[PDB]
Design a protein around this ligand. Sequence first.
Ligand code: 2TA
Length: 387
Amino acid sequence: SWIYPTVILCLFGFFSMMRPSEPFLIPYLSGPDKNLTSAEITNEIFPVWTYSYLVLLLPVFVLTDYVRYKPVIILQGISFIITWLLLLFGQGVKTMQVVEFFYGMVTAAEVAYYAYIYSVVSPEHYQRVSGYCRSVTLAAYTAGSVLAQLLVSLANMSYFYLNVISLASVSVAFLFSLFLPMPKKSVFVQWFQDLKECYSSKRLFYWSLWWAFATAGFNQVLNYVQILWDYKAPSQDSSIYNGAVEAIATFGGAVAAFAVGYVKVNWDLLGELALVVFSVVNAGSLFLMHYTANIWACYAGYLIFKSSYMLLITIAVFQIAVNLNVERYALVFGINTFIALVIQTIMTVIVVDQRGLNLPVSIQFLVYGSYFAVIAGIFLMRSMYIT
Ligand SMILES: Cc1cnc(Nc2ccc(OCCN3CCCC3)cc2)nc1Nc1cccc(S(=O)(=O)NC(C)(C)C)c1
């Protein structure tokens, strides 16, 4: 039944995201072992991830369905071993740009990871599995963060051994990906015409329109929420309080994702109302983050925002999967992720890039809340227009 592929994919997505080195990547990179600097990390290393993410998304979303979703998952596994082997034994900027290239491979193939299970189970489970998948990944993340925040503070574990544990985790995920069951088989304008037949599905260009625009703002909030927290209450101890909050904000999101899989609720006839309710919830949380000068209220707002967004994106992925009616599971997921990344890049050029408006983080989250309020009102007025 659905149990075996779902369990194997959940194990892969757990051990491939249970990465203790993620919260402490910068202290690892800028430190006594790697010996990098904050200039070479944010200007010569980090943008390589974005560039590699866009271009590797290009073949990822074109060719994933054709190769039946397993080799890209296996390619993600091999990229995990290469990325962390180079992180473990890499020196100089040149090697870390290769690390960023392979992490772009990993992040692009996450799209294949999310679509493989849809390619392998019956549509009747497409809801349950959906939540489970998202849930375990988020769970993995918080576990990793916890296994970080515990170890470094209760075993004096150097970041080198954190990355060793991370490599051990992602290598076992490679073995789990090796055991994934293989899904069964089945000019330029023609492809586009097929795309025209793929995005014409019922309520799938609408959920796609939410996915393309909402997750761009979500990634912007993810990137700059740490800066907002540092601006709100600049303290030397916040390093142990920021990530932990995210460790309890991702976990809550996991629960929200687990809400989609577990409960049996007809989403087809209620997905629009849930979409508008949780979109205005995201907007209200983001305005709650910006307006209140209290770090605890801001933490609660971030938790609410992350949980509601994770619930909404789980619903979006499930609703796209059921309504797709074509095998191009990763084509829609990949194109949605690529468009979301393009929108996020354009917005980060406009709002925070020094060549644009150069808005500080005080107004950064006001702009993000306004962006999400526009998303909600566009989607809320659509429901009224239909009725
Ligand atoms: C293991 C690893 C390898 N290479 C990188 N390169 C990289 C590091 C930071 C990046 O963010 C872009 C720059 N922004 C960072 C903050 C302000 C600007 C983009 C790419 N990051 C890595 N870790 C990492 C850094 C940020 C987010 C994540 S995540 O997968 O867990 N995604 C989040 C949910 C945390 C947003 C993981």
